[PDB]
Every structure is written in structure tokens, then in C-alpha cells.
Amino acid sequence: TKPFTLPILTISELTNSRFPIPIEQLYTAPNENNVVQCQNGRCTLDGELQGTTQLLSSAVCSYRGRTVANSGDNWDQNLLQLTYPSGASYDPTDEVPAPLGTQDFSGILYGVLTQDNVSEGTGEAKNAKGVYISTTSGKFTPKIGSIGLHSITENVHPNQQSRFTPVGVAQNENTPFQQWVLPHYAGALALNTNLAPAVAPTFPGEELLFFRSRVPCVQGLRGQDAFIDCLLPQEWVNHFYQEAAPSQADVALIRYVNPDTGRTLFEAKLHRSGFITVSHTGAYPLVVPPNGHFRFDSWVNQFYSLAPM
Amino acid sequence: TKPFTLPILTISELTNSRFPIPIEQLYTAPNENNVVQCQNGRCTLDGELQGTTQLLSSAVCSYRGRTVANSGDNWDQNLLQLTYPSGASYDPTDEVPAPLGTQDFSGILYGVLTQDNVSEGTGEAKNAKGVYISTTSGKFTPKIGSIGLHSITENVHPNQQSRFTPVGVAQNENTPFQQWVLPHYAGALALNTNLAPAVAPTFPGEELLFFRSRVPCVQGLRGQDAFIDCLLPQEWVNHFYQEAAPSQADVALIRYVNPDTGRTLFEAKLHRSGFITVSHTGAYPLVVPPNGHFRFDSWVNQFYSLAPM
Numbered sequence A, B: 001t002k003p004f005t006l007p008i009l010t011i012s013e014l015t016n017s018r019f020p021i022p023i024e025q026l027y028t029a030p031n032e033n034n035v036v037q038c039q040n041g042r043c044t045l046d047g048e049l050q051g052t053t054q055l056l057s058s059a060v061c062s063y064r065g066r067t068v069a070n071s072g073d074n075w076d077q078n079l080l081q082l083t084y085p086s087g088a089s090y091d092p093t094d095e096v097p098a099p100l101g102t103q104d105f106s107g108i109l110y111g112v113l114t115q116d117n118v119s120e121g122t123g124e125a126k127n128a129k130g131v132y133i134s135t136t137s138g139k140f141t142p143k144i145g146s147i148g149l150h151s152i153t154e155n156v157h158p159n160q161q162s163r164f165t166p167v168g169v170a171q172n173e174n175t176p177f178q179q180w181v182l183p184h185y186a187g188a189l190a191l192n193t194n195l196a197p198a199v200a201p202t203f204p205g206e207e208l209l210f211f212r213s214r215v216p217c218v219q220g221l222r223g224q225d226a227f228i229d230c231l232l233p234q235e236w237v238n239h240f241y242q243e244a245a246p247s248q249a250d251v252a253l254i255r256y257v258n259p260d261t262g263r264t265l266f267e268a269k270l271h272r273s274g275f276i277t278v279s280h281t282g283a284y285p286l287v288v289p290p291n292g293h294f295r296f297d298s299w300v301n302q303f304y305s306l307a308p309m
């Protein structure tokens, strides 16, 4: 029986699985009114990807395809007809919520669209177009292979093979950034399907543990932080995918250890469906040294009583 | 002895180690007049990182730090005083060519700077600043902790903590994109230090094998492709770092296999210093199916004669 293991990576060596930026801290908080059902960064401990999860951070919130002129519309001057990583048209009949890597938060995603290369004399960054991809637009239908592009800088050309590089999120007067409200992958008034399940603590006194990053915000949230919290960093997802070690129990007891002091700082429950719970009450950014990392201890059932963190 | 292994990943499941985009193809070519001495994606087979190589794709050609006003006189309206992943000031005395993740190509890197969040009414993408980072500028001195920022869109504010997200490259009338000319990390008229060694084929009939991507080009190279070629994908670098398996000979013989036909398509020599050679003459994008991957076969010496590819 292949042993289950975790990669040995400090917090600064981990990538957010919901946006291509490094993890900054571990963070716990109650679920109060949030449905915790993110679709990127979903993977069982025995290596089964779930939701819209794939292996490349460079594909998370990244899009590519052909631009289609959309005249008669205030917001999206063009659409993007999405293609697979190598030009193949996306099949909406796959049993997934949306193309793998699709943004799994509600609101505005900001990035740069690039298109056919232009001559040097055309101008500086003339093939770079700042665009908003808003999930509240009626044109946000990634499940059927089309999203709406709202150009901000540098008019976008139709009928050109284009790539979208994500930079951050945005919040304008009527579109709040809501990381735990899934977007309508199939368009307005349509409900989401084939979703990775929502997660929540089920043992008394426990809370979810998140890998937390601050995403750049190009509009709004003055004096505030745009947080993106994932259940698993990308490197854990990829490690479980590679190893495919069979799960021997409901929970993998993991201990957070400091390697040069040799002491365990706290412990947590890594559930077989791919998320972590800790014994704590309240919103709390975890105070841990920069060289610490989780270590797989043993297989326990879901009724294991953690030491309070 | 811990066995040496490669990760089981297809071409579309690999990331360029020199720019945060996926690998598109394998590509071999003679060195003719290029010095092949890239500094990102450099790692020995037993897990020794070299050059400017670190583990995160989100750190390659990404920068962060404090903006500094620069009036007088050239290209760069502001400088970026570089800081570590968590705000620590960069130490120029470290035995490395430049901060880890620093671009290792000559020319113009394009991306978006983000700064202190602004209110919603400030405007769309107002906290998004399109900038050129040119290595031919006298302000390109990342080895001493500072680079020059040429603003294209959205004036950059001084004295703000800022993050630069890379998007692509650019080529203007006098700054060609040269992926095999290392930039002057320490400024104009200064030579580079602490470099990972240059690589070249040393056996008759052999050429380097590259992992190739097309990087977005926001100015110039009309009708052309801005290729970035790396010696190792990021996933191999991180795998070797995790495993740290001892190298038993000068060369790891590796075979490219198709897993659903069972056939071996070609073989190659993976040298212990972390680069691949193949038996081929001429520039050639390798014609291989999308499901193929490299498999470690055996340890051989540097004089192993490969089957012609």
C-alpha cells in the first residue's frame, strides 16, 4: 500500500490554487453565511481532481480563444470563444461546471488580452488590452464556451486568436468581489452543475483552515484587502495527483512542525475529500514561523479530537 | 539509495521555468551563435537549485517592492526598490546573479504594476499601471535591488508598495528581444556573476532539447513568434528539489513514451547538471502525440550513443 505523503514546502513555497499568486498565510474563520464551494483547488487525498481543477497555475483564471465582435452592448464590446490549451473548441457536454481553470469567484476579474502581434512602429504596448471579465454580465457563459470582455485600455480587435492573462480583481460601484459566491457558469438565471461539494466543519469546535493570499485589486477596496482563500495549494493538488496514494481513513492527521526547533506548533485534520479543519473559534490569521510546514502523522477517523489550536 | 524519478506529466501539463506560461512543444536546434546560459529553470538532478531559480511560477519575471520617483532623465519615470516575497530588503551580497526569479532575457518585459488600492469612484483599472521593464536601461540593476519602470498607462505613484505582474515581452525600434543574451544584472558596463554554467552539446551529432513556449508580445514581432525556451520545466525543477535523489552517473537516460500505445518514440540524455541533449541535426519542433511523457530508464555515462531522433 503506497504511503500517503505531503510535499515539504513552506508557506512562501506554496501557490494559491484559485489565483496564480503565492500563499501568504494560513487563516481560519467560521463559515457563517458563506457557502464554501470553490471549484479550483479541489482534489481528494488519493489524487482525484474535482470541480474545475487542473494542474497548472498558469491556467487558473487564464483564457484563450477567438474574439467575436459584440456591438449593441454597453459592457462587453467583444466576446471570447474559448478554446482548449491547444486550440480545440471546448465541449460543453463534459461533466464539469465549466472549463478547467475558470474563475470560481463572483465579480470582476482584471487582466491583459494579447492578440495578433503588431509592428514596432505601431506603438508601446499596442498589443496589450486591459479588460474586465465580469461574472454578472449576461455574456459570462464559460460553460458553453463564451465569455464577455469589457475593454478598458486599447480597443480589442475581433476575429483574432487572443490570450487573457489575469492580473487581479476589481470592484466597481455595483459589482462586489465575492470569493465564495460561485459565478453563473451557464449564464444569468442558470444554476451550476457537476460541482465539487461544499465543505464545512462537522465536529464541535472546529473551523476550516484556509491557504490565504491577497489578490491585487485594480479598482475599489480602498484601505481593504482582496482576499482569496483556497482549501488546498496547487502544489498539494499536484502532489496528490502524482502520488495517488490510497486513503486509509476519513482523515489524515497532520502536524505543523518547525524543522530547526523540532517542535510541533499545532495539528489539524486533513479530510480525505481535500480540505483541512482545525480546533479554533473565531477569525484568526495563524502565527507560525516562516520555515514551518505540515507533516503527515497518521490516519484517523472524523471523530478524532484535535488539540485546540 | 533513493531512486531518481521524473514526474509523469504531459507537455500541456508542464510550465515554462523562464516565463509563467505553459509549455507548448519540444524543440531542438544547434547553438549556433547563442550562449545558452539561462538562469531560471536551472537545477541539478539531485535537487541543487542554480542561477536565479526558485520554486514558484508566480515569481518568475514578477517583482515587488517600493516605488521611487525618478525624474531625470531617461525612459524610467520610477524605480522599483526590490523586496523579498515578504517585504524583506534584498541583499546584494548573496552568491547569486540577481534576486531569484529575475528575468534572464535581454529586451523589454511588459506587465502591470499594482499599488495602494483606490476607491471605486477613481475609475476602472486605475490601480493597474502598464509598464515596460527594459534591460537596456541604465536603471536595470536588479543585482543591487533596483529596476527601472517605464510607464505606458496609468501614472505610477511614488513611495507605494507595489507588485509587478508579467504579461509578455515587447520589442521596439532599438531594443530587440534576445532570449539568449543575459541582461546586465548589475547595470550597464558591469558583467554578471554567480551564474549557472552555459550548456552546449559535447557528443557528436547531439543538440540541446528545449521546452518551448510562445510568450505574448505587446509590441513588435508582427507575423513572428516570441519564443522562450527553457532547459527544464518548472515541474521538473520542483520535483528534483523535493526528491534530492543522488545521481549515479553523468547522464540519466530518458525515454519519451506513449502510454496508450505502449511505444517509445525517442530517447534522450538528461545530464546531471539539468539539461537534455538529443541526437538530431537541424532546427526541429518535435512531432509527438499529446499524451506522451518522459520516463527515466537508466544511468549511463556522457559517451552513451543515442538512437537518432
Ligand SMILES: CC(=O)N[C@@H]1[C@@H](O[C@@H]2O[C@H](CO)[C@H](O)[C@H](O)[C@H]2O)[C@H](O)[C@@H](CO)O[C@H]1O
Residues within 6 Å of the ligand: A074, A075, A076, A134, A135, A136, A137, A138, A172, A173, A174, A175
Ligand atoms: C458601475 C455601474 O453601476 N455600472 C452600470 C452597468 O453595470 C455593469 O453591467 C455589466 C453588464 O452589462 C456588468 O454586469 C458589469 O459588471 C456592471 O458593472 C450597467 O450595465 C449600466 C446600465 O445602464 O449602468 C451602469 O451604471
Ligand SMILES: CC(=O)N[C@@H]1[C@@H](O[C@@H]2O[C@H](CO)[C@H](O)[C@H](O)[C@H]2O)[C@H](O)[C@@H](CO)O[C@H]1O
Residues within 6 Å of the ligand: B074, B075, B076, B108, B134, B135, B136, B137, B138, B172, B173, B174, B175
Ligand atoms: C525606440 C527608440 O529608439 N527609443 C529611443 C530611446 O531608447 C530607449 O532607451 C531606454 C533607456 O533610456 C531603454 O534602453 C529602451 O529600451 C530604449 O528603447 C532613447 O532613450 C531616446 C533618447 O532620447 O531616443 C529614443 O528614440
